[PDB]
From Swiss-Prot, chain B:
This is Spike protein S2'. The chain holds residues 993 to 1042 of 1273 of the full protein. It comes from Severe acute respiratory syndrome coronavirus 2 (2019-nCoV). Subunit of the fusion protein that is processed upon entry into the host cell. Mediates fusion of the virion and cellular membranes by functioning as a class I viral fusion protein. Contains a viral fusion peptide that is unmasked after S2 cleavage. This cleavage can occur at the cell membrane by host TMPRSS2 or during endocytosis by host CSTL. In either case, this triggers an extensive and irreversible conformational change that leads to fusion of the viral envelope with the cellular cytoplasmic membrane, releasing viral genomic RNA into the host cell cytoplasm.
């Protein structure tokens, strides 16, 4: 909708704030995954004899 | 004036909510820093990777 987008431009920078908040949320989840599992430097392997 | 008052009030409330969330995160980091100062500078730590 062109008219509704033009009326949405008359508001503030609200949608450069919700997009900026959700991107910071989404980036933070990868840091949460990296901090828990990637605590080892080298990928160890078990011997064939168990 | 009522329209501008509503818009500026919404912007101020959004700023206050974001500042509250950021202050909670900063308080959690400050609690972690205080625990690290109490346990690692004032003594020796047996906890792994602390």
């Amino acid at each position: 909708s062109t008219e509704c987008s033009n009326l949405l431009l008359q508001y503030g920078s609200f949608c450069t704030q919700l997009k900026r908040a959700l991107t910071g949320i989404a980036v933070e989840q990868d840091k949460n995954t990296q901090e828990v599992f990637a605590q080892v430097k080298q990928i160890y392997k078990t011997p064939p004899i168990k | 004036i009522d329209r501008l008052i509503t818009g500026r009030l919404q912007s101020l409330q959004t700023y206050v909510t974001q500042q509250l969330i950021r202050a909670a995160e900063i308080r959690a980091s400050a609690n972690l820093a205080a625990t690290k100062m109490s346990e690692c500078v004032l003594g020796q730590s047996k906890r792994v990777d602390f």
